[PDB]
Amino acid sequence: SGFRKMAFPSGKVEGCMVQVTCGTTTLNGLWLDDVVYCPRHVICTSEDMLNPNYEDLLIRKSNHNFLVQAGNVQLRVIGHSMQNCVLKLKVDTANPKTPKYKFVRIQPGQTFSVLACYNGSPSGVYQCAMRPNFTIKGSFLNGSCGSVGFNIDYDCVSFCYMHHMELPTGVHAGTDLEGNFYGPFVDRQTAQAAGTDTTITVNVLAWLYAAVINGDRWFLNRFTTTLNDFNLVAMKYNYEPLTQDHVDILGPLSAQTGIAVLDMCASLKELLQNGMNGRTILGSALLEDEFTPFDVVRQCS
Amino acid sequence: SGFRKMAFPSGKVEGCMVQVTCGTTTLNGLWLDDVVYCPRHVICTSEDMLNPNYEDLLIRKSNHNFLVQAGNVQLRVIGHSMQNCVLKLKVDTANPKTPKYKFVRIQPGQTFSVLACYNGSPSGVYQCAMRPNFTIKGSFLNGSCGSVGFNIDYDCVSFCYMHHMELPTGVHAGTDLEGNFYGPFVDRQTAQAAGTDTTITVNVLAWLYAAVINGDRWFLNRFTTTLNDFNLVAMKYNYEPLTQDHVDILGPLSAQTGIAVLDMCASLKELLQNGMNGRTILGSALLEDEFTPFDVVRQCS
Numbered sequence A, B: 001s002g003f004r005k006m007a008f009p010s011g012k013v014e015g016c017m018v019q020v021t022c023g024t025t026t027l028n029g030l031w032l033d034d035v036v037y038c039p040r041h042v043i044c045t046s047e048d049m050l051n052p053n054y055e056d057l058l059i060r061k062s063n064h065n066f067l068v069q070a071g072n073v074q075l076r077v078i079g080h081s082m083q084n085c086v087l088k089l090k091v092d093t094a095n096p097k098t099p100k101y102k103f104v105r106i107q108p109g110q111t112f113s114v115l116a117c118y119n120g121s122p123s124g125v126y127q128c129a130m131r132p133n134f135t136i137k138g139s140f141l142n143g144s145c146g147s148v149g150f151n152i153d154y155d156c157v158s159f160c161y162m163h164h165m166e167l168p169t170g171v172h173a174g175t176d177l178e179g180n181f182y183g184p185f186v187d188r189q190t191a192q193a194a195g196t197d198t199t200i201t202v203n204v205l206a207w208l209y210a211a212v213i214n215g216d217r218w219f220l221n222r223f224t225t226t227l228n229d230f231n232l233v234a235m236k237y238n239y240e241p242l243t244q245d246h247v248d249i250l251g252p253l254s255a256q257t258g259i260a261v262l263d264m265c266a267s268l269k270e271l272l273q274n275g276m277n278g279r280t281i282l283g284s285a286l287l288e289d290e291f292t293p294f295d296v297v298r299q300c301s
């Protein structure tokens, strides 16, 4: 019993973290096979961050300008290209610690584990969610840049996130491993709008199922409701609209608790309208939206 | 910027987790050098759990009865002893993945990382605290038993916790790595009282410093107070009494924020008396007590 924001074990990713230096700038890189991946802003001097021409900056750079360290061992850079907002440095050595892996673009609402690093050394691991507005609320300091997010299916690491920026508002933006930003962000030091963040409704319902499963049942009410009536309330409170896809992926949790999705939706409606009244659910005084129905099922299995 | 319940990277401990079978019973063990450590209740059949004589049960057991698996590789058990509530199985192979490590008995209020395992496979990592009443509020299923808690100082893993039991009340009890329980618990299936849990006051103050440092300042008030006056309020609300030791370890955070400990204490007094009023601090509607002043300093450094 019990329910915790649990991260995937980080071992497989620790053995891939390297330090990448280019002039004065140091940040983290991801060493898979004979390629190192990092944010391309490693080639920027602080004086170019307002509006860098990344091509033009990269053009004044040759292989030997890139200092890739893995612990003690230096690596030799025998090729460099720029793919969207990441540098791919081809090195002489295949990573002997390279796990099985894929690159995946996740969708807003999905969760992943983050290994927060500094100078190519892992410092910490936490679980978080791609917010609907494609930001993440992480824990990143200067030099955390290039820190990666991942899921682990069996022996297979799926890398979904590389950290590039903290926004003027204190939240975090980054790319997939092909260097395409999540959201409307660019790797420039300008004031950039995140947009309105909404609550991931399907996740809040998964958490409610998690709570029922762990003995917290007080919010269960006599009522039920409609997908339409529910979504009307959802929009008022900046909750994402709930679809039949969402109802479908909540099925296993419906099945295990013997509570219909729409009766759970009706409990949620009331919590939204009446607040928590001073009560708590799985030790929280706030509605949690950073567990997927998959995360709840995994932890409860 | 940002603030997250961050765990230590788990890599160094993944390479130590093994499966231990004795009859029908399987749980996790910790393979360091030529010794495997696990909970001694691995020798119990479900019918002996009411009141086992562990000596007498161990006596009807020889080396070959113990099935220690590390991935695929079986290990050979050439010696077994019982130290308080753990089995030490001496095996033929030194763990080649053995990190530098110590065994440490932590104090209530201190935090550690937990690698939750099933059948000697790591599933998940989360951060938690030894509650004042020596329980932990973890996330453990059947077969999670033998899952370990640890801190990482540089290259040195300090193991502090081995998981033995969920209590009838849904919370978690376990031992240090020498097999001595934290708290008044025994490895018997009886109803056992945890006792009154209190809030770790020094941790709540560290979290408030964490919040000031990350731009959340609304709870800062005009008042100040006294260690005596404060502790009077602390006791009313089941907060641990604050000592000059606590004031002293909050010094670095005092120094960085330019806020005196006792002015922070006065902010806390008011939050305790007035509640949060619907506001939040670092995205929480509740006072968080599972970061130490060390944890706050590490994450903020």
Ligand SMILES: O=C1N[C@]2(C[C@H](C3CCC3)C2)C(=O)N1c1cncc2ccccc12
Residues within 6 Å of the ligand: A041, A044, A049, A050, A140, A141, A142, A143, A144, A145, A164, A165, A166, A167, A187, A188, A189, B001
């Ligand atoms: O280290 C850098 N450097 C840039 C990238 C730079 C931008 C992109 C081109 C101009 C500025 C940054 O966003 N940060 C930080 C990242 N994550 C957490 C931080 C916390 C505090 C300070 C900087 C952070």
Ligand SMILES: O=C1N[C@]2(C[C@H](C3CCC3)C2)C(=O)N1c1cncc2ccccc12
Residues within 6 Å of the ligand: A001, B041, B044, B049, B050, B140, B141, B142, B143, B144, B145, B164, B165, B166, B167, B187, B188, B189
């Ligand atoms: O697997 C066991 N077996 C014992 C140890 C057994 C006690 C100690 C002698 C009698 C009973 C146990 O406490 N659990 C669980 C542990 N952690 C989370 C669980 C969650 C659900 C069910 C059992 C759990």
